[PDB]
Every structure is written in C-alpha cells, then in structure tokens.
Amino acid sequence: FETLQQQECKLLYSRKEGQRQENKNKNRYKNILPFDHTRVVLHDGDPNEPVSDYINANIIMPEKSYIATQGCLQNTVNDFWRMVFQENSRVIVMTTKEVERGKSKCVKYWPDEYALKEYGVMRVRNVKESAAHDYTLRELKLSKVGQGNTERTVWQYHFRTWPDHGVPSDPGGVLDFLEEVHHKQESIMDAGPVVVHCSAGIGRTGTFIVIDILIDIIREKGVDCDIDVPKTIQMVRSQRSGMVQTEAQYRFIYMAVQHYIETL
Numbered sequence: 001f002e003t004l005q006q007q008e009c010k011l012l013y014s015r016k017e018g019q020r021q022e023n024k025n026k027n028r029y030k031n032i033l034p035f036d037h038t039r040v041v042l043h044d045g046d047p048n049e050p051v052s053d054y055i056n057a058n059i060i061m062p063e064k065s066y067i068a069t070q071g072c073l074q075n076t077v078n079d080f081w082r083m084v085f086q087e088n089s090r091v092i093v094m095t096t097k098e099v100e101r102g103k104s105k106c107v108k109y110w111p112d113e114y115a116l117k118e119y120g121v122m123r124v125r126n127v128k129e130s131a132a133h134d135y136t137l138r139e140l141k142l143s144k145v146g147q148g149n150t151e152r153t154v155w156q157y158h159f160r161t162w163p164d165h166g167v168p169s170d171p172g173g174v175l176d177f178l179e180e181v182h183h184k185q186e187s188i189m190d191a192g193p194v195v196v197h198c199s200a201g202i203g204r205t206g207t208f209i210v211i212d213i214l215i216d217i218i219r220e221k222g223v224d225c226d227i228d229v230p231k232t233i234q235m236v237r238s239q240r241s242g243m244v245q246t247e248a249q250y251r252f253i254y255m256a257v258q259h260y261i262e263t264l
C-alpha cells in the first residue's frame with residue numbers, strides 16, 4: 001500500500017478547475033480535487049451563475065463505468081442531480097451515513113417516501129423505500145421540470161451498516177449489496193455510470209468501485225484469472241486521486257475479492 005502512497009508524492013495530472021475561486025466552496029475538502037481531464041462537466045446551468053459547470057466528481061472507466069464524487073453539500077444538491085440526469089445514471093451508491101462520528105458526511109438530497117422535491121430544474125419522486133439489512137433501496141423518479149417526458153427511475157442503494165471506524169470485519173454485507181447493485185444496473189439497458197460516493201468520495205468510495213471492478217473480473221473470467229489489486233488502484237487513481245486511503249481499506253479489497261471467490 002505504501003509503494004503506492006509514495007507513487008503519489010507528486011501528481012501526474014492537472015486539477016486547475018477545482019481551485020478557481022468560484023469552485024472554492026463547492027468542495028468539502030480543499031485538498032481533494034478532480035483531474036480536469038476526467039472530471040464531470042456540468043452543462044446547462046443557471047445562466048445567472050458564472051461557473052455552474054463544476055462538480056467535484058470523476059468518471060471512472062476500467063481500462064460498466066462509475067462516477068466517484070463527494071457527498072452532497074447543502075449548496076451542491078442541485079448540481080448533483082444535474083449530473084445524475086445529464087449522465088443518465090440509474091443507480092446510486094450511498095456508502096456513508098448522513099452524519100458519521102457526529103459530523104456531516106452527506107446532506108440529504110433525496111425526498112422522503114411517497115414525497116417529492118424539486119432541486120433547481122430537477123424533480124425527484126421517492127415512489128417507494130424498501131429497507132433490507134445492510135442497506136435501504138429507494139426507487140426515485142427524476143425528471144427536469146417543464147418536461148415530464150424526461151422522467152426516469154433512479155434506484156439509490158444506501159449502504160447503512162458500515163462502521164464509523166475502520167472497515168467491515170467481514171466482506172459479506174458489502175458483497176451481497178454490490179451483487180444487487182450489479183444486477184440492478186444490468187437490467188436497465190442503456191443506463192449511465194453507476195455513481196458511488198462518501199464524505200470526500202475517494203476512500204470508501206474507491207474501496208467499492210475497486211472491489212466491484214475486480215468482482216466483475218471474476219464473473220467474466222472465473223475464479224482462476226489473475227487479479228492485480230495494486231495495478232487496478234493505480235488504474236483508477238489515474239482518473240481520480242487518492243482512491244483508497246488506508247491499509248485497512250486496502251486489506252478489505254483483498255478479503256473482499258477472496259471471499260467472493262469462495263462463494264462462487
């Protein structure tokens with residue numbers, strides 16, 4: 001893990017946008033930013049706003065795409081749905097609670113069951129909240145106001161059991177969970193990138209995107225194929241820096257992948 005933490009003593013890519021004054025309070029952590037070449041660009045924003053194209057997120061495509069970004073901020077909730085809509089995403093993976101260890105990891109941006117809110121030009125209708133053990137599945141209807149013909153379902157799997165400290169002592173919950181999200185994403189033909197976030201959108205988020213990428217490998221090739229965790233992390237970090245910030249989260253990806261193979 002350290003042979004890679006060092007490999008980032010310097011960054012091979014530019015993150016000039018996130019620093020612009022106007023995008024200053026559009027990030028949760030001043031130091032965590034998105035590389036200009038992968039970052040999600042937001043079109044069609046309030047023409048009264050100078051910069052409405054920025055959102056702290058990065059398209060992550062294995063080299064099924066993903067979109068890693070931060071947990072919503074009170075002032076970014078509308079930029080968030082604009083991304084969802086613009087990107088045509090149908091699945092959302094919340095990996096953080098709304099407040100861990102007493103602090104705000106993410107702001108609520110989905111309306112209560114049966115309810116319906118409006119975020120800028122976007123409308124969201126929670127048509128039914130179901131809640132299993134490790135997570136809660138919320139069926140949402142997103143659409144741009146003034147145009148109901150654009151409406152589409154956007155399932156939001158909200159993992160809730162992840163410990164405030166450390167990582168799951170066992171990968172079972174994360175695997176059944178991801179397993180669901182996989183098939184759900186597969187059923188929706190022409191869906192956009194799966195979104196996955198957390199406080200900053202790089203640690204825990206990266207742990208999921210990564211585990212999922214490898215498990216997809218094990219579904220296509222078998223339990224025999226070769227898994228290179230370290231080459232994979234570098235692979236995503238080239239699209240978004242910091243993916244996976246701890247050794248424990250690193251070891252998890254390993255225990256995660258093996259376990260899955262055991263299951264098979």
Ligand SMILES: Cn1c(-c2cccc(NC(=O)CCC(=O)NCc3ccc4c(c3)OCO4)c2)c(I)c2cc(C(=O)O)c(O)cc21
Nearest residue numbers: 096101166197198199200201202203204205206245246249
């Ligand atoms: C572990 N970690 C860290 C991360 C990395 C380095 C340091 C910290 N620091 C801490 O606050 C822990 C300190 C502690 O012992 N508590 C006492 C305490 C807490 C809050 C207070 C306070 C005192 O005084 C005022 O406030 C967190 C990140 I960033 C991070 C991000 C993710 C992700 O998915 O995005 C993740 O899954 C894990 C992550």
